[PDB]
């Protein structure tokens, strides 16, 4: 099963920077969402979930086909809440109808990370919509109530190693768990709409207690009002993960560089890029453009 990137006809860097900018401008404008967290975190999560269905063994799932637009995937219990990100992107897609669904969903994630002051994430165009029967079944996204061995094995299916897993998980600095979506409640820290290495700092520095939430699920809580999922906390229970958590807690730049690599890889898993494909694009932020 081969998915060849095909550039939207006649489009180039400038066209995608316009789409970036529209997303970024709406991120700034629609600031009220989720008690003023804004849409950044949910857009990052959407980009991850549309990519995280990939299976390296047979190249099913993955961002290429844009299949989140079909009800089977839209309604995956694992994706509860992401409809808010999709709705955000609707007017963007209406303005730029030429962009593929997979390019739009993944570009939303890149735009959110950069506009939240995260690392630059190189991004490649050319995902092509595929039909409804290519939508992957529910159940390929990870459970949160599990341990380090679960996490490690899970991410092998996405061809991610320990360092890539721990780097990717730093995105959990962003946003919050919502009890009605996932059966977990609370943010992971104070800086949850700016992209930093706070996830690692808080894992190491907060005093965590294993409590039950109102949905009768266990989660790790701090007196400062933060929470970690069991799978988050597993990163400091496993000795190999813990070393890498300490590394990123002590080196912001290294976290940024490793996140950027792992996130681009996640977003590109399953896609074959022709040798004569354009190079990856690095979009300017609104701030860099004076916009
Ligand atoms: C073991 C892997 C992971 C598990 C079990 C997991 C689980 C969760 C769960 C349960 C939530 C809360 C959803 C809700 O209640 O609204 C969440 C939120 C989120 N996740 Fe993860 N996740 C994992 C990996 C990742 C990765 C790799 C990324 C992206 C690089 C990511 C990005 C996010 C973001 C940004 C949020 C906040 C969303 C919001 O505030 O609306 N997650 N995740």
Pocket flag, ligand 1, residue 127 (CB < 6 Å)? no
Distance CA 48, CA 44 (A): 6
Residue 62 has what DSSP assignment? S
- Take atom 5 of ligand 1 and give the residue whose Cα is closest: 144
For the chain, the structural domain boundaries read 1-141+263-291, 142-262
The alpha carbon of 167 and the centre of ligand 1 are apart by a number of angstroms equal to 13
Is the separation of the CB atoms in 220 and 119 below 8 Å? no
Distance CA 189, CA 274 (A): 42
Method: X-ray
Among candidates 117, 131, 127, 116, which has minimal Cα distance to 16?
127
Pocket flag, ligand 1, residue 158 (CB < 6 Å)? no
Strands 218-222, 227-228: pairing is antiparallel
Architecture of domain 1-141+263-291: Orthogonal Bundle (1.10)
Domain 142-262, CATH: 1.10.420.10
- Take atom 12 of ligand 1 and give the residue whose Cα is closest: 177
From the CA of 183, give the closest atom in ligand 1: 15
The alpha carbon of 26 and the centre of ligand 1 are apart by a number of angstroms equal to 22
- Take atom 37 of ligand 1 and give the residue whose Cα is closest: 175
Distance CA 255, CA 197 (A): 7
Distance CA 84, CA 34 (A): 10
Distance CA 89, CA 192 (A): 21
Residue owning tokens 């799932």: 61
- Take atom 36 of ligand 1 and give the residue whose Cα is closest: 45
CATH topology match: 1-141+263-291 vs 142-262: no
Packing angle, helices 230-237 and 148-156, rounded to 10: 100
The alpha carbon of 284 and the centre of ligand 1 are apart by a number of angstroms equal to 26
Among candidates 205, 208, 186, 185, which has minimal Cα distance to 197?
205
The alpha carbon of 60 and the centre of ligand 1 are apart by a number of angstroms equal to 22
Name the token pair of 221.
Answer: 């809580």
């Amino acid at each position: 099963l081969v998915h060849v990137a095909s550039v939207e006809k006649g489009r180039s860097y400038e066209d995608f920077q316009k789409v970036y900018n529209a997303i970024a401008l709406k991120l700034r404008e629609d600031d009220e969402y989720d008690n003023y967290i804004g849409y950044g975190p949910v857009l990052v999560r959407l980009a991850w979930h549309i990519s995280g269905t990939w299976d390296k063994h047979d190249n099913t799932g993955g961002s290429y086909g844009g299949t989140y637009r079909f009800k089977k995937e839209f309604n995956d219990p694992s994706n509860a809440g992401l409809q808010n990100g999709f709705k955000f992107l609707e007017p963007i897609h209406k303005e730029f109808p030429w962009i593929s669904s997979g390019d739009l969903f993944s570009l939303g994630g890149v735009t959110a990370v950069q506009e939240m002051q995260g690392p630059k994430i190189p991004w490649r165009c050319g995902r092509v919509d595929t039909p409804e029967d290519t939508t992957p079944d529910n159940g390929r996204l990870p459970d949160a109530d599990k341990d380090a061995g679960y996490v490690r094995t899970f991410f092998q299916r996405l061809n991610m190693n320990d360092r890539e897993v721990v780097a990717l998980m730093g995105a959990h600095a962003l946003g919050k768990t919502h009890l009605k979506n996932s059966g977990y409640e609370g943010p992971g820290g104070a800086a949850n709409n700016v992209f930093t290495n706070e996830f690692y700092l808080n894992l190491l520095n907060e005093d965590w207690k294993l409590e039950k939430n109102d949905a009768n699920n266990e989660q790790w809580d701090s007196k400062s009002g933060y929470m970690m999922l069991p799978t988050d906390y597993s990163l400091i229970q496993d000795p190999k993960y813990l070393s890498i958590v300490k590394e990123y807690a002590n080196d912001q730049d290294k976290f940024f560089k490793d996140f950027s690599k792992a996130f681009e890889k996640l977003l590109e898993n399953g896609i074959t890029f022709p040798k004569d494909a354009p190079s990856p694009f690095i979009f300017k932020t609104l701030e860099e453009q004076g916009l």
